[PDB]
């Protein structure tokens, strides 16, 4: 088979700037008919890959003027001229010169935004959940830059460390922010067995830990 080498697993770029993502084939992708059989796609998390470039340089219909593609025969480059927040994703290169069609490993386009502060929100277990037998105290530390953040849970004052899950967001396609959710789960009785519950967010932007609590 023909191998597509996308060296960089990721590529940093700041908004308004210029980026380049390089691909590499194990064979000249230029056909004797003159056409170079190379595609470029973008795949945003939870979505199907979208076409950007066909025939190595041509821009697929509905793709911003921003985008462009060039190449030698074994070396190809995708170029975004003035990078917007919505370009955040994974760029795959694909050859369709000969069967089997092969893709590049991928290159994650990471945006380098200016450090942002979380907007921490706390919610007590649902009235619906409690009647089901459980109790999930959820906390949302949203729209912060960068990804490096840690959360703590205080039950009446005592540290809560076991039975809590943290889900992290992929870089936001509107503001290039990051977000995450913390979920302390207990039983119906265990939760009612205490009064105060709080969230302790620790981020680079604030030395003084970020707190949000509720009392019954």
């Amino acid at each position: 088979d023909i191998v597509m080498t996308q060296a960089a697993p990721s590529v940093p770029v700041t908004p308004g700037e210029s980026v380049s993502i390089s691909c590499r084939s194990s064979k000249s992708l230029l056909h004797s008919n003159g056409n170079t059989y190379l595609f470029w796609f973008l795949q945003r998390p939870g979505q199907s890959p979208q076409l950007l470039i066909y025939r190595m340089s041509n821009l697929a219909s509905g793709v911003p003027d921003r985008f462009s593609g060039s190449g030698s025969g074994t070396s190809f480059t995708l170029r975004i001229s003035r990078v917007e927040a919505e370009d955040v994703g994974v760029y795959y290169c694909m050859q369709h010169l000969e069967y089997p069609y092969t893709f590049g490993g991928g290159t994650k386009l990471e945006i380098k935004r200016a450090d942002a502060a979380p907007t921490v929100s706390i919610f007590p277990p649902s009235s619906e959940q409690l009647t089901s037998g459980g109790a999930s105290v959820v906390c949302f530390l949203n729209n912060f830059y960068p990804k490096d953040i840690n959360v703590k849970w205080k039950i009446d004052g005592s540290e809560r460390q076991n039975g809590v899950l943290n889900s992290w967001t992929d870089q936001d396609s509107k503001d290039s922010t990051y977000s995450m959710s913390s979920t302390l789960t207990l039983t119906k009785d265990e939760y009612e067995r205490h009064n105060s519950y709080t969230c302790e967010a620790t981020h680079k932007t604030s030395t003084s830990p970020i707190v949000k609590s509720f009392n019954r």
Binding site: H31, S32, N33, N35, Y37, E98, Y99
Partner: protein, 226 residues
Amino acid sequence: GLQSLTLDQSVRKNEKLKLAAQGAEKTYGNGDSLNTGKLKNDKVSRFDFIRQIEVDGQLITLESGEFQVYKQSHSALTAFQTEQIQDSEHSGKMVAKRQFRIGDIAGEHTSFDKLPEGGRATYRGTAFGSDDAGGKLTYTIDFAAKQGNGKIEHLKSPELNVDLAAADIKPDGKRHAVISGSVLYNQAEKGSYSLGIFGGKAQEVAGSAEVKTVNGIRHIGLAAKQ
């Protein structure tokens, strides 16, 4: 000579045939007329061609190459020298691929029921195949016997210089006078041929031959006149 030629086999129902020469280009559809009047008689005229169709709003080129027209006074024929073609079959790419095939054989067909009732007529003209329009066609028809025979000479490929074996004149589906026979190479069968008789006084013949060679079946365009 023949002033117009109707393109039928040369451009199918949902195709467009773009012809270009000396900077000008015109597009034809099935049933459209080709102005052969402007072309030189007894010679092959060449055009660049692109055969196209439209798929869900986009125009697609199926094949391209050279389109050839041979003009007589009462008959004419077209042929295609493919150079590039769509391989919609396997690698959906436009692939360099050369093939030669006859398009339309047209003109004023002589009726089988209005042929000369006797005498012997000799026809002299051209045999043309892939990359070679220098062949000479000689054909003789005996109108008393209603039989014809001939030969192809002066083609660069030796296996294409064949005998057009004696065959009967017969009426076709439209009662046009046609001769369909066997092709011989050094007296042995190597293919088939068919010629129509054209002109009010059976002035001309036009048609084609298919010859088996070591390189595959080759097509030869044929046209001769008294």
